[PDB]
From a paper:
The [name] protein (~46 kDa) is the main structural component of [name] ATCC 4356 S-layer, built of two domains. The N-terminal part, exhibiting the first two domains ([name]_I and [name]_II), is known to be responsible for the self-assembly of the [name] into a regular lattice. The assembly is propagated in one direction by alternating [name]_I dimers and [name]_II dimers and in the other by the pore spanning N terminus of [name]_I. The self-assembly region (SA) is formed by domains [name]_I and [name]_II, building a 2D crystalline network that forms the exposed surface of the [name] layer.
The Lactobacillus S-layers are anchored to the cell wall through interaction with teichoic acids (TA), either lipoteichoic acid (LTA) or wall teichoic acid (WTA).
Residue numbers in the entry: 199 to 291, 298 to 307
Write the structure that this text describes.
């Protein structure tokens, strides 16, 4: 099956969590959320005795999570973050819920 893993430790992860900084007006860019998630977690499938990486839908998943919280993102990626929200990151042959906190 597809599973998610920690990039740095290699451990299998079921639920993830990251922190992303806002600017002094409480604005965040989706690109910084995508970087926080994808730098920390990756998806892969075992085959041919190795882990094979699988592309995650992180940007789309972030925008979908914010739209479920009634938060819009503008054409160049900025939005007003909630304090914390959950992104359901998907990779295809698995879903990794990732808690995103914006202090």
């Amino acid at each position: 099956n597809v599973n998610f893993y920690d990039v740095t430790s290699g451990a299998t992860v079921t639920n993830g969590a990251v922190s992303v900084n806002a600017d002094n007006q409480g604005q965040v860019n989706v690109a910084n959320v995508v970087a926080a998630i994808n730098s920390k977690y990756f998806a892969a499938q075992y085959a041919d005795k190795k882990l094979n990486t699988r592309t995650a839908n992180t940007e789309d998943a972030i925008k979908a999570a914010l739209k479920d919280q009634k938060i819009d993102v503008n054409s160049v990626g900025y939005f007003k973050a909630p304090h914390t929200f959950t992104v359901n990151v998907k990779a295809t042959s698995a879903t990794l819920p990732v808690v995103v906190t914006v202090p």
